[PDB]
Subunit: 32 residues, 3 copies
């Protein structure tokens, strides 16, 4: 059960890093 | 304590998923 | 082990929060005005 939660936590981390990088990429595309 | 942690993980996933969808929408606003 | 995982989850929540704020900024950048 703790192992199952650890997998879910590492997946959430993957997802957040990916969203962070997608935001950064879009900012680079548009500019102020 | 473990069920509190499981609830927090579920909430984090819900918030990540919302952010994902917001990013997708903003991409299409530029795209 | 559980304490360590709690700490990781708190860090993920921080990262989610920072991402929320960056998304809000992007919304202003790509919206009309
Ligand atoms: Cl998490
Ligand atoms: Cl996120």
């Amino acid at each position: 059960r703790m192992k199952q939660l650890e997998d879910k936590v590492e997946e959430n981390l993957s997802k957040v890093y990916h969203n962070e990088n997608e935001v950064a990429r879009l900012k680079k595309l548009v500019g102020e």
